[PDB]
């Protein structure tokens, strides 16, 4: 190996990348420490890295990256008064002292809300001091998203710096800042959600589940590449995502850069869509590789019948190698079905292996798998019909009405869940159809099923901290690929005792008449959640009508005077109406 691995990482990543990655790692481990302490720690670490790269014979950096980072970290966090039950695990040492910070990551911290100052003062402070401003941006974005993907974060910071340096020195200021930065924040939220999905899969269902997922995704993405190249790529990026998800940020970025270099070195052996990615810089190179379009469908592809169902030695070949055989099957199937969802391909592979384990090593083997591909017809027909009906229900209802419909549906399904997480999950579930119902019936399903799984994993992780619904936990821990089939097959919870009537939850105030559109919509959806929880047995049309009445008075008397009079009168009237249904 390479002695003084901190020096090796510093040499490979560079100076500024090393500093930014160390800042990201520190901010993700400590989500409550102030920015100045993180800057001081990062500066000390990078001076140590400079000293050790200057002379490898240093007597201190013979230690590993994890113990070095912990030593520089938990001495500041050695006080168990401000961070709560956080300094306890600094007492122990490697390797449990890494779990110290791994298990203490807070997905939903109660950090103070951002103010978002005006554009002019914002980028004049940017011009006043850029490095501190960008470090503050990285620290703030890493605080609220402890499971962010670090090289993606570096790319986002680079794009943010480029936007600031490019489009506020011009004539107008906000015209470029607001829409561009809104697009970047939406991209950041989406990337954080995807990386949280990957990290949760790796940390819960094992490395094999993520390896199978990545094999399916890459085979769907690189149909031309042979199985050896796909296996090498999935091993490399599985190591990468394990390293980021385990807190090994520096080596994770290093390995992602190496993977991008390999991929654009061997494009011709992998895919033809990569010819336009690595001409970009390293960060943009990796981003393009991670988001490259699917390659063209190869011709003369067999139907999988002669090799996987008709072959008489299929169960034997499974017997010698189970993991390799299932990887080959999943790779071939994902090659032949790019329109199929990745988790759908995982479900199909699981069904195939369950059938093979069930019978081929019992009685006549051939008298099962000759018809095993007939078992996949309902497995693919269910998601197609589900997303078809969801997109149809979305097309004439629109954004907000679709949000309301999904919200009342999921509140009926699992009323025990807390209101804010339920509202957020419903909002994202409406954004599903908002983003990929416009595609034809050849690319709707990837968006649909994949980002449905992303949002459902967000629900599962938000529910893990305060487990209150038995079914939600039961089928969030059950399987990673069957989350959406569970949350679709769940029926109305009969055992749920209706929530006690509280008039406060159905009464609005002056603030909603002057909030933004998003905040007013969220408050209205929260009121809908409370109403459905109060009367879970009501029908869909009744809730639709009462929500129509809610919007009716909200847009009736938010523009007139005597606000309190309207609030009181309308609240009492609609409370009486809802009580009388």
Ligand X SMILES: COc1cc([C@@H]2c3cc4c(cc3[C@@H](O[C@@H]3O[C@@H]5CO[C@@H](c6cccs6)O[C@H]5[C@H](O)[C@H]3O)[C@H]3COC(=O)[C@H]23)OCO4)cc(OC)c1O
The residue ranges that bind ligand X (CB under 6 A) are: 116-117, 122, 125, 132-133, 136-137, 140-141, 144, 156, 160, 181, 184-185, 187-189, 192
| Residue 392, marked binder | no
477-504: buried (b, 16+ CB within 10 Å) or exposed (e) per residue?
Answer: eebbbbbbbbbeebeebeeeeebeeeee
What is the closest distance, in whole angstroms, from the C-beta atom of residue 22 to ligand X in the complex? 17
| Residue 509, marked binder | no
Cα–Cα distance measured from residue 23 to residue 42, given in angstroms and rounded to the nearest whole number: 6
DSSP per-residue codes, 198-245 = HHHHHHHH-HHHHHHHHHHHHHHH-SSS-HHHHHHHHHHHHHHHHHHH
Quick one: CA dihedral 450, 453, 455, 458, positive or negative? negative
Cα–Cα distance measured from residue 525 to residue 411, given in angstroms and rounded to the nearest whole number: 11
Check: CB of residue 234 under 8 Å from CB of residue 216.
Answer: no
| Residue 470, marked binder | no
Cα–Cα distance measured from residue 77 to residue 72, given in angstroms and rounded to the nearest whole number: 10
What is the closest distance, in whole angstroms, from the C-beta atom of residue 70 to ligand X in the complex? 25
Cα dihedral 294→441→405→189 (10° resolution): 10
| Residue 66, marked binder | yes
Tokens of residue 224, six digits: 């031309």
What is the closest distance, in whole angstroms, from the C-beta atom of residue 182 to ligand X in the complex? 6
Only one residue has tokens 């560079």, namely 14
Check: CB of residue 445 under 8 Å from CB of residue 387.
Answer: yes
Of the pair 27, 278, the CB lying nearest ligand X is at: 27
Q: Give the orientation angle of helix 35-54 with respect to helix 130-144, to 10 degrees.
A: 110
Of the pair 10, 156, the CB lying nearest ligand X is at: 156
What is the closest distance, in whole angstroms, from the C-beta atom of residue 105 to ligand X in the complex? 16
| Residue 2, marked binder | yes
Of the pair 196, 256, the CB lying nearest ligand X is at: 196
Cα–Cα distance measured from residue 3 to residue 63, given in angstroms and rounded to the nearest whole number: 9
Cis, bond preceding 95 (omega within 30 deg of 0): yes
What is the closest distance, in whole angstroms, from the C-beta atom of residue 184 to ligand X in the complex? 4
Give the contacts of 348 (CB within 8 A, at least 6 positions apart): 333, 340, 376, 379, 380
| Residue 248, marked binder | yes
Of the pair 148, 308, the CB lying nearest ligand X is at: 148
Of the pair 253, 574, the CB lying nearest ligand X is at: 253
Tokens of residue 535, six digits: 């009367």
Of the pair 131, 323, the CB lying nearest ligand X is at: 131
Check: CB of residue 61 under 8 Å from CB of residue 6.
Answer: yes
Of the pair 146, 433, the CB lying nearest ligand X is at: 146
| Residue 94, marked binder | no
| Residue 254, marked binder | yes
Q: Which of 487, 496, 485, 510 is nearest to 568 (CA)?
A: 510
Give the contacts of 64 (CB within 8 A, at least 6 positions apart): 5, 94
Of the pair 155, 210, the CB lying nearest ligand X is at: 155
| Residue 236, marked binder | no
| Residue 243, marked binder | yes
Only one residue has tokens 């390896």, namely 211
Only one residue has tokens 């990285």, namely 138
What is the closest distance, in whole angstroms, from the C-beta atom of residue 464 to ligand X in the complex? 21
Of the pair 192, 271, the CB lying nearest ligand X is at: 192
Tokens of residue 231, six digits: 């296996």
What is the closest distance, in whole angstroms, from the C-beta atom of residue 429 to ligand X in the complex? 19
What is the closest distance, in whole angstroms, from the C-beta atom of residue 565 to ligand X in the complex? 36
Q: Give the orientation angle of helix 207-221 with respect to helix 227-245, to 10 degrees.
A: 130
| Residue 72, marked binder | no
DSSP per-residue codes, 78-122 = G-TTTSSTTGGGGSS-TTHHHHHHHTT--SS--PPPP----HHHH
What is the closest distance, in whole angstroms, from the C-beta atom of residue 411 to ligand X in the complex? 26
Of the pair 192, 231, the CB lying nearest ligand X is at: 192
What is the closest distance, in whole angstroms, from the C-beta atom of residue 133 to ligand X in the complex? 4
What is the closest distance, in whole angstroms, from the C-beta atom of residue 512 to ligand X in the complex? 21
Binding residues for Cu cation: 2
Binding residues for Zn(2+): 66, 246, 248
Binding residues for (4Z,15Z)-bilirubin IXalpha: 239
Binding residues for Ca(2+): 5, 12, 243, 248, 251, 254, 258
Binding residues: 2, 5, 12, 66, 239, 243, 246, 248, 251, 254, 258
């Amino acid at each position: 190996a390479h002695k003084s691995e901190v020096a090796h990482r510093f040499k490979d990543l560079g100076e500024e990348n090393f500093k930014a990655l160390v800042l990201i790692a520190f901010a993700q481990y400590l989500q409550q420490c102030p920015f100045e302490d993180h800057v001081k720690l990062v500066n000390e670490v990078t001076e140590f890295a400079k000293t050790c790269v200057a002379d490898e014979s240093a007597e201190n950096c013979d230690k590993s990256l994890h113990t070095l980072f912990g030593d520089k970290l938990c001495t500041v966090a050695t006080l168990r008064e401000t961070y709560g039950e956080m300094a306890d695990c600094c007492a122990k040492q490697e390797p449990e002292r890494n779990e110290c910070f791994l298990q203490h990551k807070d997905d939903n911290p109660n950090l103070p809300r951002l103010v978002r100052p005006e554009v002019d003062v914002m980028c004049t402070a940017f011009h006043d001091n850029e490095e501190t401003f960008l470090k503050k941006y990285l620290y703030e974005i890493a605080r609220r998203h402890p499971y962010f993907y670090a090289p993606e974060l570096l790319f986002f910071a680079k794009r943010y710096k480029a936007a600031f340096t490019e489009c506020c020195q011009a004539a107008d200021k906000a015209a470029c800042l607001l829409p561009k930065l809104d697009e970047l924040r939406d991209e950041g939220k989406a990337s954080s959600a995807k990386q949280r999905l990957k990290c949760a899969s790796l940390q819960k269902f094992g490395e094999r589940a993520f390896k199978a997922w990545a094999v399916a995704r890459l085979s769907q993405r690189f149909p031309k590449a042979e199985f050896a190249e796909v296996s090498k790529l999935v091993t490399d990026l599985t190591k990468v995502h394990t390293e980021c998800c385990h807190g090994d940020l520096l080596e994770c970025a290093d390995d992602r850069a190496d993977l991008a270099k390999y991929i654009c070195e061997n494009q011709d052996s992998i895919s033809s869509k990569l010819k336009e990615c690595c001409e970009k810089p390293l960060l943009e190179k990796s981003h393009c590789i991670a988001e490259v379009e699917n390659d063209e469908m190869p011709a003369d592809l067999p139907s999988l019948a002669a090799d996987f169902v008709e072959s008489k030695d299929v169960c034997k070949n499974y017997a010698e190698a189970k993991d390799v055989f299932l990887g080959m099957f999943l790779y071939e199937y994902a090659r032949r079905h790019p329109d199929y969802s990745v988790v759908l391909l995982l479900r199909l592979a699981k069904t195939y292996e369950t059938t093979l384990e069930k019978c081929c090593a019992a009685a006549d083997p051939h008298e099962c798998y000759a018809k095993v591909f007939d078992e996949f017809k309902p497995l693919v027909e269910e998601p197609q019909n589900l997303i078809k009906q969801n997109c149809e229900l979305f097309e004439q209802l629109g954004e907000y009405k679709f949000q309301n419909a999904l919200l009342v549906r999921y509140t009926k399904k699992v009323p025990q869940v807390s209101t804010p997480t339920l509202v957020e999950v419903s909002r994202n579930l409406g954004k599903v159809g908002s983003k990929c119902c416009k595609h034809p019936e050849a690319k709707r399903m990837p968006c649909a099923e994949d980002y449905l799984s992303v949002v459902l994993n967000q629900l599962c992780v938000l529910h893990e901290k305060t487990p209150v619904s038995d079914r939600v936990t039961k089928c969030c821990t059950e399987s990673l690929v069957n989350r959406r089939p569970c949350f679709s097959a769940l029926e109305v919870d009969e055992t749920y005792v209706p929530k006690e009537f509280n008039a406060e939850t159905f009464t609005f105030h002056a603030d909603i008449c002057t909030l933004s559109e998003k905040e007013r919509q969220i408050k209205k959806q929260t009121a809908l959640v409370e109403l459905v929880k109060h009367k879970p047995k009501a029908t869909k049309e009744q809730l639709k009508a009462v929500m129509d009445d809610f919007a009716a008075f909200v847009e009736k008397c938010c523009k007139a005077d005597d606000k309190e009079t309207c609030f009181a009168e309308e609240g009492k009237k609609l409370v009486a109406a809802s009580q009388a249904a």
